[PDB]
């Protein structure tokens, strides 16, 4: 709800 791409997966 705060930083959507902060985990393992970042779209690229």
């Amino acid at each position: 709800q705060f930083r959507h791409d902060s985990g393992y997966e970042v779209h690229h």
Epitope: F2, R3, H4, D5, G7, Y8, E9
Partner: antibody, heavy 115, light 113 residues
Framework: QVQLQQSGAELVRPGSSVKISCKAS????????INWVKQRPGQGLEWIGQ????????NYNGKFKGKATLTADKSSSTAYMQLSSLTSEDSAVYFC????????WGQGTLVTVSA | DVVLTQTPLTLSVTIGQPASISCKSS???????????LNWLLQRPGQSPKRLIY???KLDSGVPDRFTGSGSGTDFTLKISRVEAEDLGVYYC?????????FGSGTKLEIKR
Amino acid sequence: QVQLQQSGAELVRPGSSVKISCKASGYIFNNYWINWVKQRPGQGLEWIGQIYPGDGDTNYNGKFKGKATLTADKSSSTAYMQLSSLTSEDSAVYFCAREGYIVYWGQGTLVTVSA
Amino acid sequence: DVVLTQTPLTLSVTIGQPASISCKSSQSLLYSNGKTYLNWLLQRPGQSPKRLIYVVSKLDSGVPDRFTGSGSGTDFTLKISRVEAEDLGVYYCVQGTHFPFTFGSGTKLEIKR
């Protein structure tokens, strides 16, 4: 389907502690942050803190340092929040949420602090 | 901490009319990677919150395109092109650019009929 199943309603005597759980399924538990959010009766939302189960990393709202402790059991894909030394200010609904490109939410756990 | 100020704090909107909520930040929400972590949530009474918009303007899947978000730096807006009965509840802006993460105070959307 992604599901976050939170533990049931709690009754906690003043000064005692409670540990509530958030059982995750439907995704790779180690790969996403779990956030915890507080909603006191009738008030807005507050951020407590978060844990990244893959490595146990945590970040906290300083307001809840020494009140909330976040852990995660990787084997059972369950996140936990322990709340210590409860007062009436801790009576609230607590939500867990899985951060991501889609966010998923637990159903909330109501905690009542009362004798 | 980042203070998020929402205006107005309550809305009363007739079905079919548009609505707009302002969210203003006390700090830039631009992050080092070029993204701006200003998101919008809705919570109905009886329900858990749900995210509607992320990074200013991206629409969550399943959320009607009646909802749009805009803004940059410190001024942000959530817009509803035409309100429907099921849009009632409390709308929050929330930020994840700076720790600790913070929420606006919430804007209650009531339907006028």
